[PDB]
Structures are given as C-alpha cells and as structure tokens.
Paper text:
The published [name]-specific inhibitor, PF-4708671, was also used in this study. Recently, the structures of [name] complexed with PF-4708671 were published, with either the S6K1KD protein or the protein with the C-terminal extension including the hydrophobic motif (S6K1HM) and its derivatives. PF-4708671 has an ethyl group on the pyrimidine ring, which is accommodated in the hydrophobic pocket formed by Val105, Ala121, and Leu172, next to the hinge-binding site, while F108 and F109 have fewer hydrophobic interactions in these regions. The ethyl group is located in the hydrophobic environment formed by Val105, Ala121, and Leu172. The trifluoromethyl group contacts the side chains of Leu125 and Lys123 and the main chain of Gly103. As compared with PF-4708671, the five inhibitors found in this study have lower potencies, in terms of the IC50 values ranging from two- to more than 40-fold.
Ribosomal protein S6 kinase 1 ([name]) is a serine/threonine protein kinase that plays an important role in the PIK3/mTOR signaling pathway, and is implicated in diseases including diabetes, obesity, and cancer. All of the inhibitors bound to the ATP binding site, lying along the P-loop, while the activation loop stayed in the inactive form. The zinc-binding site is composed of the C–H–H–C residues, and is located in the middle of the activation loop.
Residue numbers in the entry: 85 to 246, 250 to 374
Write the structure that this text describes.
Amino acid sequence: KIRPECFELLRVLGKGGYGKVFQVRKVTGANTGKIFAMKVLKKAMIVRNAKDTAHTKAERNILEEVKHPFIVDLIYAFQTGGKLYLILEYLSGGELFMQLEREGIFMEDTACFYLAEISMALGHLHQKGIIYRDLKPENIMLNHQGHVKLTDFGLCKESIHDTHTFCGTIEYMAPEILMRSGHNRAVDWWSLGALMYDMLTGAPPFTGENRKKTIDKILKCKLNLPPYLTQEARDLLKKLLKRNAASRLGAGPGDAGEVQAHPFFRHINWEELLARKVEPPFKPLLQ
Ligand SMILES: CCc1cncnc1N1CCN(Cc2nc3cc(C(F)(F)F)ccc3[nH]2)CC1
Ligand SMILES: [Zn+2]
C-alpha cells in the first residue's frame, strides 16, 4: 500500500502553479533508502479546468505506457483527497540546458550524441502515438551517467499563465503549433532542429526583441545557416527547420529512421547507443 507516508521529503526541485516536484527518500519496503522524484499536484487547482484535468490524465497514461532508456520512468502513482502524486526515478544529472549554458556552443560531436539519443526517444513516443512538442533544453534531463531523459509530459510548470502553449519560451516550437492550425509528429522533428541549432550556434534559430517578433520570425522561417558548421550539420538543419511540416526529415513514414539515417549521425552505432554503451560527452558526477 504505497502512501505519502512511505516517503520523506528532502528538498524542492521545482515549484509551479499546479504543484511541486520534490526529491524524496522511500523509508518503507524493499526500496527503503532509495531516492526518487515526487511530483505533487494540487487537485483543486486542476479540476476547475477541463483541459488541465485531461492533460493530467494524459500525463499519467503516457508515463504508464512508455518504457524506454531515454524517457523518465514512473515508479508509483497514487492520490489523496487533495493531491495527485507521481513517483518518478530521480535524475541527478540536471537539465541539458545547464550543459549548454556552461559550454556556450557544443562541439558537433557533443551535439550529435544528445540529438541521437533524443531521436530514439522521439521514435518511441511516435510509435505510441505521442507527440513531445517542445525540445527546449530545459525539457531534457540527464541521468547520473550523462544520458538523455525526456521528462516533460504534464501540466505547465509556470506560476503565471498566458491554455498553456505560450506560457514558457516558444522558440523551439513548430510554426503550426503557434498558429494552432493542426499538427502531428512532424512538430518534434522541427523542434529537434531548433535544439540542434541552439547547440551549435549558441541560440535558437528564430528570436525577436519580443514575443510578437519571435512568433513572426518562426512563421516566416527564414533560416540563417551559419557557414562554419559541417555540410552534414547544415543539411540536417535545413531539412528539419522547414515551414512545410510534411516535407521535414522525419515527417515521412520512416519517422526517426529517416533522421537517424542522415550523414550527420554517420558515426553513431544505434545498438550501442540504445544500450547506453556509448560514453557521454559530459559526466555530471565528475562536474
Ligand atoms: C520529475 C522528474 C525529475 C526527476 N528527477 C529529477 N528532477 C526531475 N524534475 C524534472 C522536472 N523539473 C521541472 C518541473 N516540472 C514541474 C511541474 C510542476 C507542476 F506541479 F506541474 F506544477 C511544478 C514544478 C515543476 N518543475 C523539476 C525536476
Ligand atoms: Zn501555463
């Protein structure tokens, strides 16, 4: 019988309008002493909104349904009168954002490793009919070894809200999401490109002085390909960051297989990648 009393709270990892994420220690059962992450949602906040209530259901369904090395693991889920609890694996490696912030610009080999692992996670989600939408580098964490974990499947984590599409940065989201004109898994391959661009140039591809100007630039999609990148990196970017969603690399029947076949990923051994037998560019434990 998993209860809130089965866990002691250690610290707040995140705080938002709908609740909190804690680092916790399990103090009962065979897992006594194990460290987890605990997401606690406020029911009252959520049930007063039909979309959020659906989104909260979707989150738990997704987590219970996916199982993949590069996607965060759900260990337990329960609820009380006022709270919904999700017990996730604790990831000690931080957000991908922090590595990018420290490094300024990734070397291409570094970027390739992360994008390669992410592509496998995306392919898994798409097989399950799930769209990730937003690969801004805060939405990707690293485990203790330095491997990728997609984490963002639930409610908007902001305290102030703009519907939640526009509540955080929109710089990594596809034009057709911003226009609300209907979309599909192709938006993830767009977002992979935006993240790649961020990794290799220091900033996402389309940024304006304000929110209005940023949206305009994304819709116009006039990509500036820096001349310094390899031909492979440039070609992959040009095929991901396209306004015509159907024509994006990855948007076809092959999905992730299409992207993973690109010359930019030519040195990647996918069997070894998936088994996490490939040495990551950064080791959080050593940092
Ligand atoms: C739960 C997976 C995880 C595993 N291991 C270590 N760190 C992790 N997280 C990943 C998520 N990250 C961001 C975040 N999501 C949030 C959601 C909320 C919400 F309750 F929905 F309002 C509030 C604050 C939030 N902060 C906090 C640390
Ligand atoms: Zn919001």
